[PDB]
Design a protein around this ligand. Sequence first.
Ligand SMILES: NC(=O)c1ccc[n+]([C@@H]2O[C@H](COP(=O)([O-])OP(=O)(O)OC[C@H]3O[C@@H](n4cnc5c(N)ncnc54)[C@H](OP(=O)(O)O)[C@@H]3O)[C@@H](O)[C@H]2O)c1
Ligand SMILES: O=C(O)Cc1ccccc1
Length: 314
Amino acid sequence: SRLLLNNGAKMPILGLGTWKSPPGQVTEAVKVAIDVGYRHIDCAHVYQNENEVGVAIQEKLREQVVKREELFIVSKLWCTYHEKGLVKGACQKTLSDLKLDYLDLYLIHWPTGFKPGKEFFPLDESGNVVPSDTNILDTWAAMEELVDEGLVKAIGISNFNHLQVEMILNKPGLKYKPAVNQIECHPYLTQEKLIQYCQSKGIVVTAYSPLGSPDRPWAKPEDPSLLEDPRIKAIAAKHNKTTAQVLIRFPMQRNLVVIPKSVTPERIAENFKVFDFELSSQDMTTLLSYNRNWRVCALLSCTSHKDYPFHEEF
Ligand SMILES: NC(=O)c1ccc[n+]([C@@H]2O[C@H](COP(=O)([O-])OP(=O)(O)OC[C@H]3O[C@@H](n4cnc5c(N)ncnc54)[C@H](OP(=O)(O)O)[C@@H]3O)[C@@H](O)[C@H]2O)c1
Ligand SMILES: O=C(O)Cc1ccccc1
């Protein structure tokens, strides 16, 4: 139900994701998620919907449905805010949109820093992404002060490869270890090496895009579908569960936190009904064998960036 983080806090193993959740739909989605029993919401400034997520959280708090301590609210620092003097400001903007006074967890969204500005993906005249000369260790030191100032309870990373995680763990004067590395993970990208690395260092892994992100804006029709994989449908039929429920239970039995996105109330409810069954070790080993090393999120505009995470093996 909950995993212990290295700061002592308990992170709920199931959360609601909010990337691509339209502002006009996400307030309803979050309110239903909280009624249904979700206690963990994954957010980000770059999703352009934190205000509307925050309206739902405020409504449920005022209603007494949950108290603030029961909720685990995550957001992420966007790439254009990596320099030291910008980090606190980005966090405070997210805090006011969400209408909270602290975050439970704040992640560096990607290891790549972009030129600061109003564009989330700043382009030059030849059309490619303009990098910041900032690095990971300096951004980490700026994240560490947010903990010292009470704005966030825990800090972590996202889309970091093992050498990048290593860089942080080996930083002279390291005060707070990354609590969480949030990475893409599903049966087509099982991440066995990066997961075994992080867990050995006491870092909790959160699996994003657990259903394969079928609503990703760069989807093609010849791309594989997890939800339609007949081999995964078969494992689900055996358990009297849906394929989505199998795909959500899968990371859970690997001791991963999982954050499926939905704005549809019956799917939000369906995705919650995953605690009352178990995949056998045979089901688990079978699902692991489906690995293709296929990424939904490869950040393909930044493949030349000095900190691009996905050139390394893991
Ligand atoms: N840190 C990062 O870099 C990063 C990157 C990507 C994602 N994430 C986080 O991870 C979250 C989840 O990943 P994701 O949004 O890419 O995708 P996902 O959860 O793998 O898939 C979401 C899609 O699946 C549909 N869906 C949900 N439950 C379903 C069910 N029971 N049956 C059939 N279809 C279902 C949703 O439709 P409806 O919404 O229409 O129901 C939506 O189209 C994101 O929202 C975000 O919070 C983080
Ligand atoms: O990185 C993410 O979480 C997903 C995303 C992709 C492209 C632009 C904004 C967000």
